[PDB]
């Protein structure tokens, strides 16, 4: 129908940016229209948002300046827009100290109508932003190296005691520490790395090996033991990590002797710096002044709390307490409850006024969901979710994904927020914020019918007459199954008095495609057909995937607006194969309503998965046809020639008068005495009445002159008194290839013909 498929503009393929969603934007103060696209983070492009313009019959893109810059993997980008500015939300990962779990929420930035920063928001530590009274307006870890002494001066009983001590210590530390690994070294005469950090990953093997080591005996070369621990462990070649803390536990008996290395220089050496030194004394023979001072040198600077004389089994309380971690409750395990850590605020967004925004919190409270009504200028928000009266209700509402999609509805003199919960029960639902007083909560108003159809994943209010009050609400079920994943869309009519929803129609895609995904993307495209009524577009990105060549696939369906509501069938179907080669998932994002070609006519953008397309909108022409007969009536038994004057006119103001019909040609034909078995009159020239081709001149009027002759043969007097019917049918012959100007198109909802009656003089007293 109205969209010019023959002249698309496409972002360069394979080059930057790799489009994910596209939307048209316009600054109300300057009337510039840009095309905002969002791309995932890549080495070429760091930015998540780009503004593109039409230059040299292509779409060139330049990144926007002050938007958040994602780091690492792609975790989500969301860009909505209204006449109050552009909102961009990025998902981020954060790790708190000594936390064995991560946080996943959004950092957002609000920009003005002209793409200048206005607000920044981080949604970590949500507790300090929340304001439960806010009025809702409705109009590496640690490594521990052990230095076991079995170097003579140690009886089998004391050695066995030491082995039990070390084994119990290892087990205890593995229980109270998660990311704490171990290494060991026996240094009796020789030095022998009994086990290494890589083996520490298998706890059972290391524990079994601890009991399986045998005394080596000989002489106590403790300083050499330290130097060996530093030349073999803590070194990244054997598995150590530079970031992790470093501890040591020295089970020496104090009888150092025959040490090839100097103790004092080894202990204080720069390499030793940065590693703790816990010293345990073995044997009763540690009561000499020299041995005591040796221990004191070995142990950390605050000798108390590090130096010891007996194997007390809780002497290592300090690390056992300092290194304690916290675990967020996960699948099948106990832990800290999931309240807001994985809230993913900003998953869906919506701009309400100059300050306030609406955000989706799909992951809040064990994936129950919700939404945050954030006030950007005051930096205070209010969380809104479904009420739970008992534990059963709370556990029943989990994993509903409320806040997956958010929208707003304009009633006569009020507002109403709604949300999508595609996983609700198991078929989906749409909620509405039923403010009752101080408390406002989401209560379900619409429910899907099929499991896994993801009802409520897409919302799309439509104000057909553009009066400021929503008249319909489109709700999509992209994965609906009949033979494959066809999709299905539901149109709901909002009562003008109660605000209730009543099903009106169920839109389905073109028959013959079992893998369409009809309804995955939906948008109100403003007014395209120049009729002052809003038109809508639905997207079916999987249409034609794999079948036949499969070079391109996807579809977009244009539905027009009527005073009654949406149409019954689509007025256009744009197939990706006819648009350009290589388009994949054509129709997973759409926008419109803003002029980007330079005429006064709103245009449209359809974003594939990696490219964006832009289509002009053609001018819709409405032809008024009149004719003057001569003589005004048919005299009884007339035999003269009838003179005919036929004049068309452009009753449509969609085009300047001094452009006529462009390169479109008017093709009209005449039918004489329609409906009569034998025609009373006839045309004087077959050429002048069949396939008559004319070129519209400058202006809004065209005219012609024709002649009619009496039909041959005996008079068919049977129905003389009835008015004679003359019919005119017309079309447009629009050129073939790409054109500089979008050629006009006849209106699809006005009959392309007219019938004029010529009375026949009566035989009564009064002829007419």
């Amino acid at each position: 129908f109205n969209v010019d498929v023959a002249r698309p503009w496409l972002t360069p393929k394979g080059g930057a940016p790799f489009v994910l969603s596209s939307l048209l934007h316009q600054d109300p103060s300057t009337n510039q229209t840009w095309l905002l696209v969002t791309s995932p983070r890549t080495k070429r492009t760091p930015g998540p948002l780009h503004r593109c313009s039409l230059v040299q019959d292509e779409i060139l893109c330049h990144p926007v300046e002050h938007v958040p810059i994602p780091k690492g993997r792609h975790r989500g980008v969301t860009v909505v827009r209204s006449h109050h500015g552009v909102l961009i939300c990025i998902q981020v990962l954060v790790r708190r100290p000594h936390s064995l779990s991560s946080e996943l929420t959004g950092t957002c930035s609000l920009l003005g109508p002209d793409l200048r920063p206005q607000a920044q928001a981080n949604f970590f530590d949500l507790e300090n932003l929340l304001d439960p009274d806010a009025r809702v307006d409705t109009g590496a870890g640690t490594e521990i190296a052990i230095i076991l002494d079995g170097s003579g001066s140690i009886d089998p009983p004391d050695f066995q005691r030491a082995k039990d001590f070390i084994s119990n210590m290892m087990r205890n530390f593995y229980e109270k520490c998660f990311e704490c690994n171990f290494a060991l070294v026996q240094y009796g005469g020789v030095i022998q790395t009994e086990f290494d950090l890589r083996d520490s990953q298998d706890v059972m093997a290391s524990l079994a090996r601890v009991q399986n080591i045998t005394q080596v005996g000989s002489v106590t070369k403790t300083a050499s033991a330290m130097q060996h621990v530093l030349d073999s462990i803590f070194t990244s070649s054997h598995g150590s990590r530079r970031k992790a803390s470093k501890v040591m536990v020295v089970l020496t008996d104090g009888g150092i002797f025959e040490d090839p290395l100097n103790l004092t220089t080894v202990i204080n050496s720069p390499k030793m710096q940065g590693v703790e030194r816990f010293a345990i004394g073995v044997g009763e023979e540690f009561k000499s002044a020299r041995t005591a001072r040796e221990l004191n040198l070995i142990a950390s600077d605050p000798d108390e709390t590090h130096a010891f004389k007996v194997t007390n089994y809780m002497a290592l309380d300090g690390l056992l307490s300092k290194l304690r971690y916290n675990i967020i409750s996960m699948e099948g395990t106990v832990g800290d409850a999931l309240h807001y850590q994985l809230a993913q605020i900003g998953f869906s967004a919506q701009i309400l006024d100059e300050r306030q925004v609406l955000l989706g919190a799909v992951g809040a409270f064990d994936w129950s969901g919700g939404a945050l009504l954030y006030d950007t200028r005051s930096r205070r928000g209010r969380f809104l979710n479904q009420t739970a009266a008992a534990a059963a209700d709370a556990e029943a509402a989990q994993y509903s994904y409320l806040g997956y999609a958010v929208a707003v509805l304009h009633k006569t003199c009020s507002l109403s927020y709604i949300a999508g919960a595609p996983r609700y029960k198991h078929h989906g639902a749409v909620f509405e914020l039923q403010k009752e007083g101080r408390e406002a909560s989401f209560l379900p108003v619409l429910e899907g019918e099929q499991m896994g159809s993801y009802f409520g994943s897409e919302l799309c209010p439509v104000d057909i007459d553009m009066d400021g009050s929503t008249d319909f609400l489109l709700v999509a079920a992209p994965f609906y199954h009949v033979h494959g994943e066809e999709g299905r869309v539901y149109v709901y009519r909002l009562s003008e008095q109660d605000g209730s929803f009543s099903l009106a129609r169920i839109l389905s895609g073109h028959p013959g495609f079992t893998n369409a995904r009809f309804g995955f993307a939906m948008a109100a495209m403003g007014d395209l057909s120049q009729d002052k009524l809003t038109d809508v577009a639905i997207g079916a990105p999987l249409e034609g995937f794999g079948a036949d060549d499969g070079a391109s696939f996807g579809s977009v369906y244009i539905y027009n607006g009527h005073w009654d509501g949406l149409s019954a069938s689509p007025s256009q179907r744009i197939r990706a194969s006819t648009v350009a080669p290589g388009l994949q998932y054509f129709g997973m994002s759409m926008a419109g309503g803003f002029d980007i070609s330079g005429d006064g006519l709103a245009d449209i953008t359809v974003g594939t998965l990696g490219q964006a397309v832009v289509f002009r909108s053609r001018p819709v022409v409405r032809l008024k046809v009149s004719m003057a007969f001569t003589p005004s009536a048919l005299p009884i038994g007339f035999n003269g020639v009838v003179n005919v004057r036929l004049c068309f006119e452009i009753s449509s103001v969609t085009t300047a008068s001094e452009s006529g019909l462009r390169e479109a040609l008017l093709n009209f034909t005449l039918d004489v005495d329609v409906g009569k078995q034998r025609r009373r009159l006839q045309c004087s020239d077959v050429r002048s009445c069949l396939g008559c081709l004319r070129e519209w001149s400058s202006g809004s009027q065209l005219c012609e002159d024709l002649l009619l002759m009496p039909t041959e043969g005996e008079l068919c007097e049977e129905d003389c008194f009835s008015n004679a019917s003359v019919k005119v049918s017309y079309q447009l012959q629009t050129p073939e290839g790409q054109t500089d100007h979008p050629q006009p198109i006849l209106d699809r909802y006005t009959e392309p013909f007219a019938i004029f009656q010529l009375p026949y003089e009566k035989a009564c007293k009064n002829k007419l």
Partner: antibody
Amino acid sequence: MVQLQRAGPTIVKPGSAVKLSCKATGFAYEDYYIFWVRQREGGNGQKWIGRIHPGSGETKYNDKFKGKATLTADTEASSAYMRLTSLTSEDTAVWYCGWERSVGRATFAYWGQGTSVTVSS
Amino acid sequence: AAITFNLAPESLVVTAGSKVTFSCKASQDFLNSATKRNYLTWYQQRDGKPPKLLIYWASARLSGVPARFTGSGGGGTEFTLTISSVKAADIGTYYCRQLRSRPLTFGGGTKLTVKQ
């Protein structure tokens, strides 16, 4: 009535750039295309240069003048400009702006008076 | 690349009150398959003046052009402009031009000269 005027002849040194002008009157400027064409002396004929739509500022260029020409439209003053970059002695010729026919197709329905460009040291 | 034009002859020796015939031919077809109009234009230039539009589509004259000019030129690949009776004002050069596809190209021109 539709008519176009230009700045007139110019003399520039080799390597400089000239910004010709084509003021338009008698019609809505943000509507109709402006086409440029150069008639090289010595009987070399004519060759179409480029195109620009004042409403959207979009352009399209013949490959031969892709980096040589650069068209722009000043909707406020209703004046169209072409910039010739890194001129040489060869570029000396007479250049014309144009106005497409409203109905049908005729790239140059109206022409400007003429403007001659001479590059010499 | 581009469509080539073979506008010939380079010049005609003519006398006032005689017929004329230019012959411009294109390397490709101009007949637009939808509007069925051949996309070719004719221009006229006199010495020291900018050219003028004579015939926009293959056979359609512009307002103000005297009737003695006829576009003829059917087929879509070969075209002929015929001047009925040459006159002193008609002395000049005529160029044919492609209109269907980019880049737009001209025919080189054909100049008239009075015989003597």
